[PDB]
Amino acid sequence: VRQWAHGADLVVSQLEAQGVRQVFGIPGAKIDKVFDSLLDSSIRIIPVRHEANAAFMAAAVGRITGKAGVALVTSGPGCSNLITGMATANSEGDPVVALGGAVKRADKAKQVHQSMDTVAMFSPVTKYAIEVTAPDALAEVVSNAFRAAEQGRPGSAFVSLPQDVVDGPVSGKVLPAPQMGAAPDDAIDQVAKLIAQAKNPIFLLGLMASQPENSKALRRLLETSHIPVTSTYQAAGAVNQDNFSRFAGRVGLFNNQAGDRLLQLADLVICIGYSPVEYEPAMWNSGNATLVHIDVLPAYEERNYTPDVELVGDIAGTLNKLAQNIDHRLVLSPQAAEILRDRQHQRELLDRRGAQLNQFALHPLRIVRAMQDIVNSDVTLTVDMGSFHIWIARYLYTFRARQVMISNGQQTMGVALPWAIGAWLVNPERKVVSVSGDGGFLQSSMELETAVRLKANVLHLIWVDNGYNMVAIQEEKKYQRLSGVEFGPMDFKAYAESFGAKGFAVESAEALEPTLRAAMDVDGPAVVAIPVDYRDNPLLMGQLH
Amino acid sequence: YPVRQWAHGADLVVSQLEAQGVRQVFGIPGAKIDKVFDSLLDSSIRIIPVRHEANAAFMAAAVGRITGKAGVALVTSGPGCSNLITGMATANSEGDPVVALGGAVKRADKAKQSMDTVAMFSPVTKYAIEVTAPDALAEVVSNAFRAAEQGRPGSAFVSLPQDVVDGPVSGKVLPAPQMGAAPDDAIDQVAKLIAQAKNPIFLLGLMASQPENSKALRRLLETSHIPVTSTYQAAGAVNQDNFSRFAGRVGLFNNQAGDRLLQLADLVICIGYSPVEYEPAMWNSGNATLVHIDVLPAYEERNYTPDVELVGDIAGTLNKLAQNIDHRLVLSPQAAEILRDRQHQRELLDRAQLNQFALHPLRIVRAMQDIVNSDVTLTVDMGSFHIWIARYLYTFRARQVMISNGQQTMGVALPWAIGAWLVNPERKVVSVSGDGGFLQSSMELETAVRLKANVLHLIWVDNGYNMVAIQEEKKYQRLSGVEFGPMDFKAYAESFGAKGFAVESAEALEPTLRAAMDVDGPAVVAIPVDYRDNPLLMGQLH
Amino acid sequence: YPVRQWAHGADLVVSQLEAQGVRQVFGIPGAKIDKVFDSLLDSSIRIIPVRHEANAAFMAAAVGRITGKAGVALVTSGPGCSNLITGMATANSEGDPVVALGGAVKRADKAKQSMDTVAMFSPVTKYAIEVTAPDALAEVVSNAFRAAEQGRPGSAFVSLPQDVVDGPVSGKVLPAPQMGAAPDDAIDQVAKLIAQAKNPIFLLGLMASQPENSKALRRLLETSHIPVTSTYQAAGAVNQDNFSRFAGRVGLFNNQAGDRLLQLADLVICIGYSPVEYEPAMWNSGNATLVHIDVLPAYEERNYTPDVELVGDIAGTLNKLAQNIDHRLVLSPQAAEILRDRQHQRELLDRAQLNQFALHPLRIVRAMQDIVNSDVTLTVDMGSFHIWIARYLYTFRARQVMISNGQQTMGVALPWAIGAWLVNPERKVVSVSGDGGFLQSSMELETAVRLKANVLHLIWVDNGYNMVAIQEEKKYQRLSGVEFGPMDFKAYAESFGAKGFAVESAEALEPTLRAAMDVDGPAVVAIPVDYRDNPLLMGQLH
Ligand SMILES: Cc1ncc(C[n+]2csc(CCOP(=O)(O)OP(=O)(O)O)c2C)c(N)n1
Ligand SMILES: Cc1ncc(C[n+]2csc(CCOP(=O)(O)OP(=O)(O)O)c2C)c(N)n1
Ligand SMILES: Cc1ncc(C[n+]2csc(CCOP(=O)(O)OP(=O)(O)O)c2C)c(N)n1
Ligand SMILES: [Mg+2]
Ligand SMILES: [Mg+2]
Ligand SMILES: [Mg+2]
């Protein structure tokens, strides 16, 4: 152990030990010693314009690297401004460690309830929430926060750091930054035998199946077996139409997915890193099939989810072993092949690569096609929440992006831009495309200054309707009249340029592709406003569950 | 197990309990939860009414600790639930799987001008939920058992709103884990470290004392002959007789061979151990290769940051580790000396004619060891007597001992004993406590008599709270609030219909214990004790 | 009271208690909180060790209810605190001012691998705080008493970390409200409504039973002669003898004159009343002018939305209201009939030779009324006997009765009685309970004997949980978990050193009660009861 002048120095040293490359946040009196200590480290300080976005950026870093993104904020409002961010990350399973300042331990303002009980506030939306009361257990708590966020089913962790603890001296050491084995060999063999006997098997991918550490094993198992696959949105990016011929689409939103039909037909369903909370089991489990559960944790038994076999342990190890016990590729049953044949037909019908679509404001389909043109395998795509989100999800089979951040169970708006910046920081050599509506854009657009400051190569697309359309179409369907969903117009090109970023505003369908192309080629942050005609939304909504 | 339409959610609950292998339920009925007690009447599940809910949690814990399956407590709303709190916290601390089903007001009256029980139980449980979705009643219960029984066992609380249990519901009962050993690659990495170790030592924790790990543990020890020491949560895992290289229990006394071996160690392998069981600072000097083996990743601490972590099925890991141990260990000079000292230490601790009255603690311990045989379960309450018994655990040869008690909750012994007896009603159980601990749960004597439980409860009588008195004496040289009046425990026990005895002389001690042990049913023996020599034992504590 | 340097925070605490007028403290010592018990030794404050912490909260509540000043409980960390929960919740529900001082681990070990007691107590208290600022120790305590004693009294919890009470602190003891009557203008507005009322009625709540409001209440009733009815929290505020227009207690029975008058009312004036005391839906038809008088604004409900609210000092308001009442009330035809019916009702309820054995409830009530005189405090536990006693409260003439119990917590009687006796040790106290309630707190008999408390505890013996059994019978026509074994309560009581009695025939009832009452000290009488006629009484409940 060492004698540390400040607890902040030990915290920073622990962060370095955790492999943290940067920290997102906003400084304040209570937490400033930590920002100060970061000056003497290898960790880059990234100042944001609103704490909420610090949590969103950290979440993106977590989902991509698999290692926790870090947010650093001051006490009081500093911490409360992160709450929505922490809840969103926790919901989508993104590892995030938030370090929040607090008044000194003995501050009498605590007894008079003059200072926020942040631990109580964060406990409901985090996997781990705690306040350091013992200076000597500083590295310990920070270390445990990372383990709690990155292990098991990933989530967010909050650590409250009293000012006196980080400012005062401490004596401790840096704790170096798991070793869980695959499922039992007998159970794996058991499953390999169920597979060899199944006529209509199918894989249902969940959150844990999309983790980076399981990518290789998953790819190997799919290639060896050639068994159909369907995914929940928390695994939307694990597999796509283009990289697997037997992909059946993502389930949980549209009522005609091949994944749902195959699951109904299945005589053997193998869930990977799946939890019933990702998609209602009653929606696909007919009970007429043998059920296998593969994950880092036991299954949450439920009326429509009582696994016949449960393989708990290291997912990658379990999938690799299973792959080694497969003698041949699956020969699709006439029925299964028919269902895949139908998805092929529906994609054909959803497509329109030859239609004019030159109306203005732009038709959602014309915008989706233009987005597909610029989003390729070297481009990451982040998607906000709103009506355009449903359009993009319907066509996820057409996006050939390196990766896509779209899952958003809490339906939190404003995540796209912050997600893109975080995704960009993980791979600054690649391009990132973020997309939102005007509502979401204005909730985090302040981070545009952050983007310009970082020279972040992010292209943000704004679908403009001058209102909260996703809520409006719900009100129209229920009351046939609108309330609180309409607002005024804005000059987004000028809005963007006022930050020093490149701004564009589509004034006709013909200008769409050229504009997106020029915006993509811009070396640095750019924003493109796209007026949209949401009149056809009812047609798309008719495909929802 | 098909999806059915149930006349009362209470019926689904009961079927779910039967599916979990529940044989009995402990508790006290009330208006809000009465439909469940009524449903149990058509069940194969036995209803065991207690006299105080706290004891339902204690009895359920013993059941859980012994069977591996959650003990079940059932109480009504309000005070029925709040009376379980201490019991639930005690089970959670000792890792005993318990599921408490607590009644509550109908959902609609919750915000009406009822206790927020979930909020009160959340701090002392692993799982605390309230059923708000009638159609997910079987799920919440089922998953409560999962929470209590899996990983590091603990207590689970489920609030059942009256309208949910009395009203009809649809649903199916859910059937009552398959994890493998640690990564073989890592098991070799550890096996290699063992071959390079000069002073290897095993530190056993809670999970190491689980029956599912028995065979593999013994197999690993018989093949390596590496010395062993245990926390009190694994007090029963290994004893002096079956392992000559046993180094005792660590955490209480400052002169244990286990601690000396830990300090001397170059390689320490912890199994089913968690810091909470014994302050790492107390034994981890910091310059030894630390290996962690458990069902859960290590809960890192300042002085407990393992170099290697083997997470997974313990029995599987240990079995694989054993197969990778070529030669048995040859104790180093210091190691051998340390173990030799423990032997000399035992000879000393054992070595006179203590015929004074009130009885000398050593005399009582000696007599206790005589009646406690390998077929008997011994339960120990909290108090000064606890220290005396702990000091001599090496010479106790009981089927099992329930002594671990981190919260230091008094009153646990009798209810634990009743719970343990119900698991194996053909055997005898012996519980011991002080007068203070005795009156906190003695109301269960009626329950013991009602059940015809073959339990013998011993009471060390000093007429006070001695364990507290000695700490006050040491710190203030005067006493406060630790002295109370005397009682005739013989008549007290007889009033319940149990057999009572009161030792009135030293020579009467042994004969009285025998007459009590020979009683087929509940019996209590009050034993006046002279705690004057406690200072000499306390000097042996950390 | 100057700012001093204290050797131990524990010393400041004690001085603060003395400043609050605390005469005794109830509790059980422990390592974390022992310095406080030690500090009390140099205090004028008496240390009263209990046998179970829950009872410390019950005894403290009686003290608070009677003196108006918070009763004090002192316990150690962990189970010491969790054992107080039910007691604290019961006090908070009945409005009894109680301050619990609970020990805790040193501040630095809190987040270390200790119970989050504040979080557990917050749901059942008015004030739950933990001292994190050593220099504000006297403040947190002082303000805990303020929280318990002011507004609507309730319980308050204070967690004292061991390092804070053992370590030195600086600070001064803080001296131990001045609110005026409601706005005179509004008092007239109400006085006007009273002059226009044809069927005015007073509904008394908790605050109306406070001694500080006695004189003003009587003065207001003697001047207006307006009929009165009371919730059970104000059961003692007024009785049949002192007010011929008393309409009984409302909330339990479906045939009360009070409810009929409330329904008939055109003007209802509630004093110190809060909906929680009696469901407004049960009596507020909704077409009467509703006036609310209390120390706190009305806690609006669906059927309790007062037209006029007089917030402020109750005694002052009532005194001013009285001075604005010219003529006494002339009962309307219906009002007079209703009161006449209550008179005929009493004549009936009173009207035979019940010499059966086991004893008939009516016989027991009759005998109870004979021994309970105007100098005796009567405490009543929860169970079927409770209903029987409530039915006949009009014929009980005790100094005071502790019966209100919204949580329906069993075991309250004896500890309450001990607490009430300590307030007036020269008087006799009588507590009554069922066998179930008796065993939950009977351990305090040792405390009673130790104190030489002049308490007589009566036990209605049925060998079960009857109040629950009758509800099961009605709903399921069968019983579950409500039957237990018999006991010899005579020997049980004697074992403690108290006087025990067991009624073995009807004719022996009265003589046995007398012999017990004549005992100068603790005495217990077990009374076998035949609950067969309970269905006839239950038909009288809402
Ligand atoms: C923070 C927050 N508040 C409210 C909502 C509810 N809601 C869901 S998406 C959305 C916004 C729709 O506006 P926009 O982002 O402009 O997208 P559009 O549907 O209009 O394309 C709203 C208001 C939300 N998701 N997040
Ligand atoms: C519920 C509870 N309250 C307070 C304590 C603190 N304390 C620890 S052991 C004990 C009791 C000692 O009395 P007894 O059981 O008579 O044993 P002795 O040490 O006197 O033999 C007390 C008061 C506790 N453990 N549990
Ligand atoms: C702590 C607690 N648990 C459960 C209840 C529910 N219930 C209400 S009164 C009562 C007991 C009745 O037993 P007893 O005291 O013997 O009275 P009886 O009605 O039989 O005369 C019970 C079990 C309660 N009030 N308090
Ligand atoms: Mg919009
Ligand atoms: Mg004792
Ligand atoms: Mg009874």
Q: What is the 3-state secondary structure (H, E, C) of B477-496?
A: CCCCCCECCCCCHHHHHHHH
Whether B123 has its CB under 8 Å from any CB of chain A: the answer is no
The three-class DSSP label of residue C346 is helix
- What is the CB neighbour count within 10 angstroms for residue B284? 23
Instruction: Give the number of residues written for chain B.
Output: 542
Angle A505-A509-A514 from CA coordinates, rounded to 5°: 65
DSSP code string of A405-467: E---TT--TT-HHHHHHHHHHHSTTSEEEEEEEHHHHHHHTTHHHHHHHHT--EEEEEEE-SB
Q: Tell me how far apart the alpha carbons of residues A326 and A225 are, in angstroms, rounded to a whole number.
A: 7
One-letter identity of residue A7 = G
Whether A351 has its CB under 8 Å from any CB of chain C: the answer is no
Dihedral sign for Cα C10, C12, C18, C19, please: negative
A84, A383, A385, A408: which to mutate for ligand 1, most atoms within 8 A of CB?
Answer: A385
Which structure tokens are listed for C247?
């309409």
End-to-end CA distance of chain C: 55
- Nearest-CB residue to B178 (from A143, A303, A312): A312
- Cβ within 8 Å of residue A139, ≥6 positions away: A10, A11, A13, A14, A172, A173, A174, A175, B302
Helix ranges (DSSP H) in C70-213: 79-82, 85-94, 117-121, 137-149, 162-166, 184-196
Contact by Cβ (8 Å): C59, C419: yes
Which among B59, B207, B368, B382 is annotated as catalytic?
B382
Q: Which experimental approach was used here?
A: X-ray
C364 membership: H or E segment, kind and range? helix C361-371
The three-class DSSP label of residue C430 is strand
Which structure tokens are listed for A522?
């811009």
Contact by Cβ (8 Å): B74, B33: yes
Cα distances from C476 to residues A338, B76, C469, in angstroms, run 57, 17, 10
**Of C66, C88, C83, C153, the residue nearest C419 (C-alpha):** C66
C370 membership: H or E segment, kind and range? helix C361-371
Tell me which long-range contacts A442-447 makes (C-beta under 8 A, separation of at least 24): A443/A413, A443/A414, A444/A50, A444/A52, A444/A53, A444/A56, A444/A414, A444/A415, A444/A416, A444/A417, A444/A418, A445/A417, A445/A495, A446/A49, A446/A50, A446/A53, A447/A48, A447/A49, A447/A50, A447/A53, A447/A417, A447/A418, A447/A421
Taking the centre of ligand 1 as the mean of its atom positions, its distance from the CA of residue A444, in whole angstroms, is: 13
Beta bridge partners of B204: B230, B271
Q: Tell me how far apart the alpha carbons of residues C452 and B389 are, in angstroms, rounded to a whole number.
A: 36
Which structure tokens are listed for B40?
């149990």
Which structure tokens are listed for B53?
């809910």
Which structure tokens are listed for C303?
């059927």
Q: Tell me how far apart the alpha carbons of residues C212 and C134 are, in angstroms, rounded to a whole number.
A: 36
- Cβ within 8 Å of residue A174, ≥6 positions away: A10, A13, A14, A16, A17, A139
Whether C205 has its CB under 8 Å from any CB of chain B: the answer is no
- Give, to the nearest 10 degrees, the angle between helix B333-350 and helix B257-264: 170
Q: Tell me how far apart the alpha carbons of residues B300 and A44 are, in angstroms, rounded to a whole number.
A: 27
Report the relative pairing of strands B169-171 and B4-6 from DSSP bridges.
antiparallel
Q: Tell me how far apart the alpha carbons of residues B302 and B71 are, in angstroms, rounded to a whole number.
A: 35
The residue written with tokens 């370090």 in the block is: A99
CA dihedral B76, B77, B79, B80 (to 10 degrees): 20
Record: contact A135-C111, CB cut-off 8 A: no
- Cβ within 8 Å of residue C89, ≥6 positions away: B78, B79, B82, B115, C123, C124, C125, C155, C407, C409
- Nearest-CB residue to B297 (from A172, A178, A302): A178
Burial annotation A339-370 (CB, 10 A radius, 16+ → b, else e): bbeebeebeeeeeeeeeebeebbbbbbbbbbb
DSSP code string of B10-25: HHHHHHHHHHTT--EE
Q: Tell me how far apart the alpha carbons of residues C59 and C66 are, in angstroms, rounded to a whole number.
A: 11
Whether B212 has its CB under 8 Å from any CB of chain A: the answer is no
Atom of ligand 1 nearest to the CA of A410: 25
Which structure tokens are listed for A4?
């540390």
A360 membership: H or E segment, kind and range? none
A530 membership: H or E segment, kind and range? strand A526-531
One-letter identity of residue A391 = W
Domains of chain A: 1-179 (3.40.50.970), 180-353 (3.40.50.1220), 354-545 (3.40.50.970)
Nearest-Cα residue of chain C relative to residue B280: C113
Q: Nearest C-alpha of chain A: how many angstroms from B440?
A: 34
Phi and psi torsions of C535, nearest 5°? -55, -30
One-letter identity of residue A513 = E
Phi and psi torsions of B472, nearest 5°? -65, -45
Please give the radius of gyration of chain A, using alpha carbons only, rounded to the nearest integer. Answer: 24
Q: Tell me how far apart the alpha carbons of residues C438 and C457 are, in angstroms, rounded to a whole number.
A: 9
- What is the CB neighbour count within 10 angstroms for residue C430? 27
Whether B484 has its CB under 8 Å from any CB of chain A: the answer is no
Which structure tokens are listed for C69?
């000043």
Dihedral sign for Cα B259, B262, B263, B264, please: positive
Q: Tell me how far apart the alpha carbons of residues B87 and B84 are, in angstroms, rounded to a whole number.
A: 5
- Give, to the nearest 10 degrees, the angle between helix A315-323 and helix A215-225: 20
Q: Nearest C-alpha of chain C: how many angstroms from B436?
A: 7
- What is the CB neighbour count within 10 angstroms for residue B352? 7
> What letter does residue C76 receive in the DSSP assignment?
-
CB pairs under 8 A between A and B: 94
Q: In B, which residues are within 8 Å of A187 by CB distance?
A: 178, 180
**Of C40, C11, C22, C33, the residue nearest C172 (C-alpha):** C11
Contact by Cβ (8 Å): B4, B169: no
Contact by Cβ (8 Å): A473, A537: yes
Q: Tell me how far apart the alpha carbons of residues A317 and B305 are, in angstroms, rounded to a whole number.
A: 25
Q: Tell me how far apart the alpha carbons of residues B201 and B250 are, in angstroms, rounded to a whole number.
A: 13
Angle C405-C410-C415 from CA coordinates, rounded to 5°: 90
**Of C330, C331, C289, C327, the residue nearest C307 (C-alpha):** C289
Cα distances from B365 to residues B38, B52, B377, B396, C317, in angstroms, run 45, 30, 16, 9, 69
Whether the upstream peptide bond of residue A337 has omega within 30° of 0, thus cis, is no
Q: In A, which residues are within 8 Å of B305 by CB distance?
A: 143, 175-176
Breaks (C-N over 2.5 A) in chain C follow: 113, 176, 351
Cα distances from C178 to residues A530, B241, C98, C172, C312, in angstroms, run 67, 74, 22, 23, 10
Taking the centre of ligand 1 as the mean of its atom positions, its distance from the CA of residue A68, in whole angstroms, is: 27
Distance, CA of B176 to chain centre: 24
B382 is known as an active-site residue = yes
Q: Which residues line ligand 1 (CB under 6 A)?
A: A 385-388, 411-413, 436-440, 463, 465, 467-471
DSSP code string of B347-365: HHHH------SSBPHHHHH
- Nearest-CB residue to B143 (from A176, A301, A311): A301
The three-class DSSP label of residue A77 is helix
One-letter identity of residue B225 = H
CA dihedral C269, C271, C276, C280 (to 10 degrees): -10
C487 is known as an active-site residue = no
Which structure tokens are listed for C507?
């004719």
Whether B308 has its CB under 8 Å from any CB of chain A: the answer is yes
Residue B161 has, within 13 A of its CA and on its CB side, a CA count of 21
**Of B235, B207, B208, the residue nearest B220 (C-alpha):** B208
End-to-end CA distance of chain A: 58
Q: In what order do the strands lie in the sheet with C429-434?
A: C400-402, C377-380, C429-434, C455-461, C523-528, C499-502
Which structure tokens are listed for B310?
């083997």
CA dihedral B261, B265, B268, B270 (to 10 degrees): 20
Contact by Cβ (8 Å): A464, A530: yes
Q: Tell me how far apart the alpha carbons of residues C193 and C308 are, in angstroms, rounded to a whole number.
A: 10
Question: Which of B113, B130, B302, B452 best tests the C interface by mutation, with the highest count of C CBs <10 A?
Answer: B113
**Of B394, B386, B390, the residue nearest B342 (C-alpha):** B394
Taking the centre of ligand 1 as the mean of its atom positions, its distance from the CA of residue A443, in whole angstroms, is: 10
Q: Tell me how far apart the alpha carbons of residues C221 and C239 are, in angstroms, rounded to a whole number.
A: 12
Beta bridge partners of C99: C72, C156
Q: Tell me how far apart the alpha carbons of residues C380 and C414 are, in angstroms, rounded to a whole number.
A: 8
Report the relative pairing of strands A502-505 and A431-437 from DSSP bridges.
unpaired
Record: contact C480-B410, CB cut-off 8 A: no
Cα distances from A229 to residues A240, A251, B73, C9, in angstroms, run 9, 11, 44, 67
